[PDB]
Amino acid sequence: APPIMGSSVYITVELAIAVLAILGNVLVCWAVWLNSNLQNVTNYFVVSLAAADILVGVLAIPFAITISTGFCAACHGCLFIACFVLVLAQSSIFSLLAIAIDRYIAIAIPLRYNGLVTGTRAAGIIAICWVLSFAIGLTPMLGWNNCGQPKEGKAHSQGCGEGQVACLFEDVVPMNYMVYFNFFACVLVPLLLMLGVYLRIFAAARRQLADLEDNWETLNDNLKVIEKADNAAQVKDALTKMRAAALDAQKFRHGFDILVGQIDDALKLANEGKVKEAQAAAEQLKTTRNAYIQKYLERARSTLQKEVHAAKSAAIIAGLFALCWLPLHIINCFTFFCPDCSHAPLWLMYLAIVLSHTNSVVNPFIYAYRIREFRQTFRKIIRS
Numbered sequence: 198a199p200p201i202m203g204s205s206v207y208i209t210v211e212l213a214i215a216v217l218a219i220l221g222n223v224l225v226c227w228a229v230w231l232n233s234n235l236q237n238v239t240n241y242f243v244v245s246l247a248a249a250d251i252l253v254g255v256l257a258i259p260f261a262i263t264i265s266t267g268f269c270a271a272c273h274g275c276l277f278i279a280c281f282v283l284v285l286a287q288s289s290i291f292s293l294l295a296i297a298i299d300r301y302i303a304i305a306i307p308l309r310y311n312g313l314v315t316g317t318r319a320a321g322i323i324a325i326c327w328v329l330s331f332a333i334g335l336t337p338m339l340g341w342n343n344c345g346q347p348k349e350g351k352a353h354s355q356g357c358g359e360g361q362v363a364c365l366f367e368d369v370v371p372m373n374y375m376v377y378f379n380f381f382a383c384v385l386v387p388l389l390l391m392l393g394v395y396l397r398i399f400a401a402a403r404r405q406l407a408d409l410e411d412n413w414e415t416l417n418d419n420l421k422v423i424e425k426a427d428n429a430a431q432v433k434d435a436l437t438k439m440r441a442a443a444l445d446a447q448k449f450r451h452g453f454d455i456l457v458g459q460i461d462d463a464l465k466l467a468n469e470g471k472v473k474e475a476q477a478a479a480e481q482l483k484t485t486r487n488a489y490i491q492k493y494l495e496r497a498r499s500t501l502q503k504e505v506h507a508a509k510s511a512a513i514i515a516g517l518f519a520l521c522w523l524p525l526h527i528i529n530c531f532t533f534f535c536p537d538c539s540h541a542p543l544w545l546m547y548l549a550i551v552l553s554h555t556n557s558v559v560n561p562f563i564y565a566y567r568i569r570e571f572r573q574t575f576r577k578i579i580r581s
């Protein structure tokens with residue numbers, strides 16, 4: 198069948214993806230610009246990620262359509278249009294890794310997050326990562342390319358001029374670059390690092406939630422011990438365990454000041470050997486526990502759960518990047534590692550290419566479905 202027929206389907210799908218990638222990610226950027234509640238370091242990387250996806254629609258997809266025709270081109274110009282998408286993919290990887298690390302910092306040392314992770318430092322990291330993404334993605338332009346061994350028969354068949362080649366991705370970009378350097382080193386390794394960071398995030402959240410419940414039970418258990426104690430040493434022993442837990446859980450303020458003071462009150466009575474007076478003093482702790490401590494427990498738990506939800510949302514974005522890009526990389530591995538295997542058919546090549554491009558569509562939906570502040574800002578932008 199005439200190649201223009203299957204090409205027309207491929208090109209139409211690519212153009213549809215480009216429109217959606219631009220519209221959704223412009224909406225992401227407009228939301229962050231407009232809503233100061235969305236202006237935080239995490240979302241600056243989200244914006245850098247949306248900018249990469251906008252450029253997939255504006256430049257990488259037009260470049261992909263162009264290179265699918267095999268048109269005659271100077272080889273190094275062909276190389277640029279082949280490799281620019283690698284810059285955008287690499288920038289996306291750096292942004293995704295930064296988001297994971299940012300969420301790990303927020304959960305693991307929340308007391309120093311705002312002093313460690315600042316807007317000015319985020320902007321510098323983003324700038325550095327874009328420079329590194331150009332260097333990584335355009336490495337073939339530095340000489341790791343097949344321009345030295347042009348396919349002259351294909352060039353002559355298409356009437357190409359001197360110094361020109363039929364511009365085809367796999368004719369100019371070396372497959373050892375794509376597999377060993379781009380895929381294994383620059384894509385697979387960062388994704389595996391992201392997985393490790395997310396495991397650390399979720400393990401830290403789970404452990405901290407367990408610590409909240411352990412301290413809550415320790416408070417209530419030791420109150421019961423005092424209640425059914427028959428001597429002052431037992432009351433003193435249990436209160437000493439309560440005091441260290443109360444101060445450790447303090448690490449509002451009034452509630453914990455009352456709690457520790459009332460523990461000290463009962464402890465002084467215990468040490469004077471006045472058991473009944475110490476047991477009555479310790480029962481007062483229940484009023485403080487009900488009015489203050491459980492409210493702190495529930496808010497801390499609610500904050501940790503919100504952090505889990507945000508980390509899950511970020512992990513979905515990273516996982517969808519892997520799901521959308523792995524098929525094309527895996528196909529490249531078959532092309533490279535199995536020269537006895539027939540090349541993946543053209544329709545599958547174009548399916549894998551369009552799938553990688555659909556990743557630039559999906560993030561705005563994840564934010565809309567998973568982040569109320571985005572979803573609410575999206576609605577206000579669309580309605581207004």
Ligand SMILES: CC(C)CCC[C@@H](C)[C@H]1CC[C@H]2[C@@H]3CC=C4C[C@@H](O)CC[C@]4(C)[C@H]3CC[C@]12C
Binds near residue numbers: 270271273274
């Ligand atoms: C700021 C944005 C809009 C700039 C976009 C510039 C793009 C469209 C330009 C910059 C470099 C250009 C390439 C440079 C060299 C060649 C080799 C020639 O034999 C065919 C055209 C080709 C392949 C050009 C295509 C268009 C190109 C990719």
Ligand SMILES: CC(C)CCC[C@@H](C)[C@H]1CC[C@H]2[C@@H]3CC=C4C[C@@H](O)CC[C@]4(C)[C@H]3CC[C@]12C
Binds near residue numbers: 524531541
């Ligand atoms: C990332 C997740 C979704 C897994 C994706 C698996 C895909 C990329 C795998 C599964 C089966 C694979 C195919 C199995 C067999 C062949 C025949 C060979 O002559 C060319 C490669 C080709 C055509 C493979 C291409 C890649 C392939 C389609």
Ligand SMILES: CC(C)CCC[C@@H](C)[C@H]1CC[C@H]2[C@@H]3CC=C4C[C@@H](O)CC[C@]4(C)[C@H]3CC[C@]12C
Binds near residue numbers: 531534535
């Ligand atoms: C966690 C996972 C997704 C990491 C990536 C796995 C990749 C590197 C694996 C999954 C399946 C593998 C392929 C399975 C089969 C073959 C055919 C063989 O003749 C050459 C190697 C080759 C082509 C493998 C290359 C590496 C490969 C593509």
Ligand SMILES: CCn1c(=O)c2c(nc(/C=C/c3ccc(OC)c(O)c3)n2C)n(CC)c1=O
Binds near residue numbers: 261264282
């Ligand atoms: C991730 C980086 N990357 C690639 O790796 C990639 C790729 N296109 C191809 C292969 C195209 C192709 C192969 C064989 C053909 O004829 C038999 C043919 O007509 C086209 N590949 C391998 N692109 C899209 C521009 C891309 O973005």
Ligand SMILES: CCCCCCCC/C=C/CCCCCCCC(=O)O
Binds near residue numbers: 271272273274275277
């Ligand atoms: C604000 C955007 C500024 C853009 C600066 C230029 C960006 C792209 C530049 C083109 C890459 C170099 C030319 C491509 C290869 C030339 C072909 C050849 O060498 O024969």
Ligand SMILES: CCCCCCCC/C=C\CCCCCCCC(=O)O
Binds near residue numbers: 260263
């Ligand atoms: C708003 C940004 C606009 C910039 C992108 C516009 C579309 C770019 C599409 C691909 C340019 C490369 C096509 C050049 C074909 C050359 C044909 C020939 O060799 O005679």
Ligand SMILES: CCCCCCCC/C=C\CCCCCCCC(=O)O
Binds near residue numbers: 254255259
């Ligand atoms: C915001 C603007 C984005 C870009 C708009 C322009 C759309 C470009 C669409 C595809 C360009 C394909 C160029 C054709 C390649 C040359 C064909 C040939 O020489 O055989």
Ligand SMILES: CCCCCCCC/C=C\CCCCCCCC(=O)O
Binds near residue numbers: 318320321
């Ligand atoms: C081809 C280049 C390869 C080397 C890449 C160099 C990496 C960074 C280059 C210049 C970075 C410019 C931005 C500096 C601001 C950083 C401040 C900060 O970290 O907060």
Ligand SMILES: CCCCCCCC/C=C\CCCCCCCC(=O)O
Binds near residue numbers: 325329332333
């Ligand atoms: C293949 C790509 C090779 C990259 C070479 C690495 C060189 C760049 C390394 C990291 C840049 C560190 C940023 C330092 C700039 C100033 C920092 C500061 O002032 O706080």
Ligand code: NA
Binds near residue numbers: 250556
């Ligand atoms: Na992306």
